[PDB]
Amino acid sequence: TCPRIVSKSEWGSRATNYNVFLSLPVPKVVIHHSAGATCSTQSSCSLQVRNIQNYHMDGRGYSDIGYNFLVGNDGNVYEGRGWDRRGAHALNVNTESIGICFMGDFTSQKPTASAIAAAKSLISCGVSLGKIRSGYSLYGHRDVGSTACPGNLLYDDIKSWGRYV
């Protein structure tokens, strides 16, 4: 029931050495969006992940891509920092959350149903592993921190997801 996850090596992540850990199991799950390009192919989504990684490391000086996981409109999940490591994404809920980023801009378009589905089964996977508390809370990125955002179709959707807060 876990979704197939494209590992770092499978999307060609470059070599990192970020080794700051979350205290498992994690209470919160935050949902983000790249506010960028979408992608419908595994190879084209893989490129996008690499582009984002490079932006974060070369552009912003992060020690790795900032999100724990990314989701493509191809329906796939891509590993970033993964289950055990701490994001740079959301402040200061980085310290106790998994960040899941949908690759796209969702102000006038909705993510693909398979992209939505992969995220949910990813969350369910983490719970079943005990990476995430069974009674987790779910937030959009605007919910958690003091950041303004425009009307967004992704964040409308996550309201109907279980455990939304």
Numbering used by the authors: 1 to 165
Paper quotes:
PGNs are normally recognized, and/or hydrolyzed (amidases EC 3.5.1.28) in some cases, by a class of PRRs, termed peptidoglycan recognition proteins (PGRPs). The full-length BbtPGRP3 consists of an N-terminal signal peptide (Met1−Ala18), followed by a CBD (Gln19−Tyr71) and a C-terminal PGRP domain (Thr90−Gly255), which are connected via an 18-residue linker from residues Ser72 to Gly89. All together, the modular evolution via gene horizontal transfer and domain shuffling results in a unique domain organization of BbtPGRP3, which has a higher amidase activity and a broader spectrum against invading bacteria.
The PGRP domain shows a typical PGN-binding domain scaffold, in which six β-strands (β4~9) compose a central β-sheet surrounded by five α-helices (α2~6) and a short 310 helix η1. Multiple-sequence alignment showed that BbtPGRP3 possess a highly conserved Gly-Tyr motif (Gly150-Tyr151) and an arginine residue Arg170, which are featured in the Group II PGRPs. Using HADDOCK server, we docked tracheal cytotoxin (TCT, GlcNAc-MurNAc(1,6-anhydro)-L-Ala-γ-D-Glu-meso-Dap-D-Ala) and muramyl pentapeptide (MPP, MurNAc-L-Ala-D-isoGln-L-Lys-D-Ala-D-Ala), which represent the DAP-type and Lys-type PGNs respectively, to the active-site valley of PGRP domain. Moreover, structural comparison suggested that the complementary electropotential between DAP and Arg170 makes DAP-type PGN a favored substrate. Compared to the individual PGRP domain, fusion of the CBD resulted in an approximately 500% augmentation of activity towards S. aureus PGNs, compared to a 50% increase towards E. coli PGNs.
